C-alpha cells in the first residue's frame, strides 16, 4: 500500500490485453497498472515491478496519468499466468490480473523405427511437434496416446487382444511432453497381444493429432499374407541334421478336406496316404528328437507350431498303421480301432 499508505489497492487496477495467448514462446500481452491513491489521484514517478507465473516480462515503463506498462511474452507451458505488482519492492495488493496461456497449435509427425516387430520386442515411437504450418519445433507440448483401431491381417476388427503398452504401462496411463527439439520418444510393447495391428493416435494438448500403426507378431501364426493374424511362426526347425517344415494353412493346401482350427488359424490336415503323396514324412524318432529340443510344449510356445493334434510319422507300427507323435509331450502311438492311417486327419511336418 506504499510506505506513505496512499496507494489504494481498490482504486488501482492491474489489467492485461489480451487475456489469452498461446504457449508458443512468442505471443505477447500488455500488462497495465493504473496506480491510484485513496482519492483516485494518479501516482506518478514510481518504481513499479511486475511478476508472472508463466512467461517472461520486459522492463516496466511509465506513461501519462500514473500508468505503468510492460510486455509479457508467452513461454512454452500452458496454464494460467497470475500477475502481481510491487512498488519499491513492496507488494501492492490489487486484484491479480490473469492471462490464459492456451495450447499452441501444432502439426504432429509420428515415426516408428520399424512398424512391425515380434511380441517381446519394443517399437521406438517418436512424436515430432512443430508450430502449425511452420518448421519450428514446439517444446514442452503435452502429449497423450490412444488406441483407435485394432485389426488382424485380414482387416477384421479384434477386441480380444491385450492392451498395448507404452513405457511398460497401459497406453492410457502415459503422460509426457516434447523435449527441447520438439520430440517425444517412447517404447511400445504388446506383451499380451494376439497378433494384431494397433493404430495409436498421438494427441497434443491443443487437440492436434496424428496416427501411426504398430504390429506385434504372435508366434502361433505363420508370416503369410493368407494368415488370419500377424505372426512370426518358425518356417522350419532343425534337429541334428533333420529339417522340419511348419504345418500348412488350409489356405495353402486347398486340395485337402481335413482341417483344424487352432491358435486363431485354420490348418490343413491329412491322412497317411495324403501326407506321403505330398512330401517326405519324418520318422517318429526324428519327430521325438525335435520335441526333445523344444520340450514341454515349447514346440508351441517357442516356435509357434500348433500342438493340440498329433503329427504323422513314416514309421510303421503295425500292418496298416503308422505311429503319430504328440509334439506337446513327445508321446507317440497308433490307432488300429479307429483306423488312424485312413480316417485320421492329423498334422504333417514335412522333412526337407
UniProtKB/TrEMBL annotation:
It comes from the Bacteria. This is Invasin. It is found in: Cell outer membrane. The lineage of its organism: Bacteria, Pseudomonadati, Pseudomonadota, Gammaproteobacteria, Enterobacterales. Invasin is a protein that allows enteric bacteria to penetrate cultured mammalian cells. The entry of invasin in the cell is mediated by binding several beta-1 chain integrins. Belongs to the intimin/invasin family. It comes from Yersinia pseudotuberculosis serotype O:1b (strain IP 31758). Disulfide bonds join 279-350. Signal peptide: none annotated. The chain holds residues 2448 to 2795 of 2795 of the full protein. Residues 11-102 form the Big-1 domain.
Amino acid at each position: 500500500g506504499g510506505g506513505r499508505g496512499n496507494l489504494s489497492t481498490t482504486n488501482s487496477t492491474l489489467v492485461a490485453a489480451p487475456v489469452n495467448i498461446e504457449a508458443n514462446g512468442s505471443d505477447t500481452s500488455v500488462v497495465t497498472l493504473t496506480l491510484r491513491d485513496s482519492n483516485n489521484n494518479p501516482v506518478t514517478g514510481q518504481t513499479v515491478a511486475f511478476t508472472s507465473t508463466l512467461g517472461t516480462l520486459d522492463n516496466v515503463t511509465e506513461q501519462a496519468s500514473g500508468l505503468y506498462t510492460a510486455t509479457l511474452t508467452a513461454g512454452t507451458l500452458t496454464g494460467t499466468a497470475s500477475l502481481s505488482v510491487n512498488v519499491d519492492g513492496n507488494n501492492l495488493g490489487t486484484t491479480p490480473a490473469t492471462i490464459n496461456v492456451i495450447p499452441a497449435p501444432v502439426d504432429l509427425t509420428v515415426l516408428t523405427d520399424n512398424a512391425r516387430k515380434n511380441i517381446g520386442q519394443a517399437i521406438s515411437l517418436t512424436v515430432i511437434a512443430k508450430y502449425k504450418s511452420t518448421d519450428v519445433v514446439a517444446p514442452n507440448v503435452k502429449m497423450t496416446f490412444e488406441q483407435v483401431a485394432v485389426v488382424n491381417r485380414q482387416n477384421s476388427p479384434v477386441s480380444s487382444s491385450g492392451v498395448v503398452q507404452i513405457a511398460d504401462a497401459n497406453y492410457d496411463a502415459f503422460t509426457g511432453m516434447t523435449d527441447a527439439n520438439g520430440q517425444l520418444t517412447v517404447s511400445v510393447t504388446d506383451p499380451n497381444g494376439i497378433g494384431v495391428q494397433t493404430t495409436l493416435r498421438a494427441a497434443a494438448e491443443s487437440g492436434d493429432m496424428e496416427n501411426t500403426n504398430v504390429t506385434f507378431n504372435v508366434i502361433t501364426s505363420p508370416d503369410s499374407a493368407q494368415a488370419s493374424m500377424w505372426g512370426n511362426m518358425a518356417e522350419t526347425l532343425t534337429a541334428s541334421g533333420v529339417t522340419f517344415k511348419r504345418p500348412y494353412l488350409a489356405a495353402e493346401k486347398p486340395g485337402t478336406i481335413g482341417t483344424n482350427v487352432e491358435n486363431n488359424e485354420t490348418w490343413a490336415m491329412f491322412n497317411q496316404s495324403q501326407a506321403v503323396a505330398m512330401c517326405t514324412v519324418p520318422s517318429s524318432s526324428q519327430l521325438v528328437s525335435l520335441y526333445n529340443l523344444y520340450p514341454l510344449n515349447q514346440i508351441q510356445t517357442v516356435a509357434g507350431w500348433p500342438t493340440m493334434q498329433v503329427y504323422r510319422s513314416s514309421t510303421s507300427a503295425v500292418i496298416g498303421q503308422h505311429f503319430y507323435v504328440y509334439m506337446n509331450t513327445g508321446n507317440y502311438a497308433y490307432n488300429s480301432i479307429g483306423n488312424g492311417d485312413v480316417d485320421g486327419n492329423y498334422n504333417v511336418s514335412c522333412s526337407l
